[PDB]
Design a binder for this molecule. Structure first.
Ligand SMILES: *[C@@H]1O[C@H](CO)[C@@H](O[C@@H]2O[C@H](CO)[C@@H](O)[C@H](O)[C@H]2NC(C)=O)[C@H](O[C@@H]2O[C@@H](C)[C@@H](O)[C@@H](O)[C@@H]2O)[C@H]1NC(C)=O
Ligand SMILES: *[C@@H]1O[C@H](CO)[C@@H](O[C@@H]2O[C@H](CO)[C@@H](O)[C@H](O)[C@H]2NC(C)=O)[C@H](O)[C@H]1NC(C)=O
Ligand SMILES: CCO[C@@H]1O[C@H](CO)[C@H](O[C@H]2O[C@H](CO)[C@H](O)[C@H](O)[C@H]2O)[C@H](O)[C@H]1O
Ligand SMILES: CCO[C@@H]1O[C@H](CO)[C@H](O[C@H]2O[C@H](CO)[C@H](O)[C@H](O)[C@H]2O)[C@H](O)[C@H]1O
Ligand SMILES: *[C@@H]1O[C@H](CO)[C@@H](O)[C@H](O[C@@H]2O[C@@H](C)[C@@H](O)[C@@H](O)[C@@H]2O)[C@H]1NC(C)=O
Ligand SMILES: *[C@@H]1O[C@H](CO)[C@@H](O)[C@H](O[C@@H]2O[C@@H](C)[C@@H](O)[C@@H](O)[C@@H]2O)[C@H]1NC(C)=O
Ligand SMILES: [Ca+2]
Ligand SMILES: [Ca+2]
Ligand SMILES: [Mn+2]
Ligand SMILES: [Mn+2]
Lengths: 237, 237
């Protein structure tokens, strides 16, 4: 049992994608998670994009958990250097049919009022109280307070290549971030037991958010574009 | 305490390096692990390059194991496509003062007669009986029969960037292989307890080998050049 899909680009109204909130697909075929007006990213924005069909990460009958690999490219343009860009984007796995959570530093995946479990890889650009220096890659399990963190220098407006791989046998989740224009490579990994955190079926996708109004800083924003995305999951039973 | 060294280039008569067997440094300052004459790689060649000073990966007094990160660039040119290039190169950690092992598929790190422990990351180009398709990256522990394997397409003559990171707290060894000219990224990781496999002090370096004469194939060869190499390790206490 191996499921998989590929998006070399995104078309308007893909029957395979479920867009929520501010998420939208541009004319250029790019998935814009957060609002961008007349070429300018806006604040107080939150958006998600989930693969329409649910994927089975583990089977309770056999006890087997799936191994998977996903690759995508994104771009984050920060037009306004000061006071501070925000907030970042994440790739996440969550139960089916969840609704966008809180924006801001919660990226739209954490819902303080009705929390749902999730595993996510974040590309954090704003330093909240619970954060280390930014930008940083983080591995999140049921919380925005990362288990592991690693700093990286953003290629403003440049393209970033990401590879996330999960090996069920070792329970290792390793992510690689590469900025081809700079030739920089960033790596991070951690042990995560998906069977202990998530239900048998889940949704996979992205979520991002720009500055929250409470910070009263309209400049706290940036773009969160996904240029391409491939996903492959393998369940031995 | 934390050891650290960097080789942005290799200078002939490199004081901080122990070259063994066919390993030598060209005029262009590249580390040629295996024999190349008049611009042509030869068979029946084996060579290693070790950092002259030993590094302490763990301390028996505190029980602490070191975390480390090493980055290097290599190039493998395969002049003769048919019948089959061989054999590949590896980055390895072994006890101090070891001597080049068997060539061929053993890369010069495995000594059937008098075996010594070692952890190595291989870039295998020839398919031996114990191998999956080639080329492939492999994680080796005391043996050339990899614990984990992942296939990759070689950029013939191109430059390859490698990042190997070891996190003592999680015991995760993750390696990233990138071919900038192709934009391809390959990743692999596994759990390895260095404290259970290696002595407190070790040597770090590279080793490679070309086709073994027993195969009666002079075309079973390729180059194994190391363009640059940086290493950093942190042993707390
Ligand atoms: C941030 O976005 C919110 C929605 O994404 C804004 O609220 C929405 O405002 C629309 C126009 O007023 C209204 O049609 C929507 O129903 C409403 N959504 C809800 C229920 O929150 C929010 O600002 C709102 O509108 C301004 C004019 C004020 O009335 C605010 O008090 C509202 O929340 C946006 N935040 C800000 C302050 O820009
Ligand atoms: C592979 O290389 C070895 C070593 O160069 C060749 O065997 C001989 O090894 C002895 C070591 O005591 C040297 O003194 C000889 O000079 C080596 N051969 C010669 C005369 O060059 C071995 O023959 C090589 N394999 C083949 C078939 O070419
Ligand atoms: C010490 C707490 O920090 C401040 O928290 C504020 C609201 O709780 C603001 O943070 C919010 O807005 C910023 C953008 O201005 C980000 O979107 C944060 O993620 C969001 O919580 C303020 O900016 C913080 O300094
Ligand atoms: C299935 C057995 O394969 C053959 O094994 C031979 C020796 O056991 C030869 O392999 C040796 O030489 C080749 C060069 O062509 C490589 O260097 C191998 O690593 C080495 O063991 C023969 O080539 C194999 O087909
Ligand atoms: C938000 O971004 C714009 C565009 O880069 C900046 O010009 C703003 O700077 C602020 O306004 C200008 C006119 C000047 O007074 C400067 O001192 C201010 O900092 C910037 N505004 C914020 C919120 O920093
Ligand atoms: C070894 O590589 C060279 C360079 O590509 C090839 O020319 C050889 O091809 C074979 O041998 C030559 C002499 C010629 O007869 C050709 O028709 C053969 O295919 C190649 N030899 C091997 C080991 O296959
Ligand atoms: Ca944050
Ligand atoms: Ca081999
Ligand atoms: Mn964070
Ligand atoms: Mn192998």
């Amino acid at each position: 049992k191996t499921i998989s899909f590929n998006f070399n680009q995104f078309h308007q109204n893909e029957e395979q994608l479920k867009l929520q909130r501010d998420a939208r697909i541009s004319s250029n075929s790019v998935l814009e998670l957060t609002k961008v007006v007349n070429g300018v990213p806006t604040w107080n924005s939150t958006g998600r994009a989930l693969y329409a069909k649910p994927v089975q990460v583990w089977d309770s009958t056999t006890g087997n958990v799936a191994s998977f690999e996903t690759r995508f490219s994104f771009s984050i343009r920060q037009p306004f250097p000061r006071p501070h860009p925000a907030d970042g984007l994440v790739f996440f796995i969550a139960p089916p049919n969840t609704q966008t959570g809180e924006g801001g530093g919660y990226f739209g995946i954490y819902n303080p009022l009705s929390p749902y479990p999730f595993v996510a890889v974040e590309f954090d650009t704003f330093r909240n109280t619970w954060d280390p220096q930014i930008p940083h890659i983080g591995i999140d399990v049921n919380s925005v307070i990362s288990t592991k963190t690693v700093p990286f220098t953003l290629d403003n407006g440049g393209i970033a290549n990401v590879v996330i791989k999960y090996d069920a046998s070792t329970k290792i989740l390793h992510v690689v971030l590469v900025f081809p224009s700079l030739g920089t490579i960033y790596t991070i990994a951690d042990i995560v037991d998906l069977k202990q955190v998530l239900p048998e079926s889940v949704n996979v996708g992205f979520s991002a958010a720009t500055g929250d109004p409470s910070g009263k800083q309209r400049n706290a924003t940036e773009t969160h574009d996904i240029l391409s995305w491939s996903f492959s999951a393998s369940l031995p039973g």
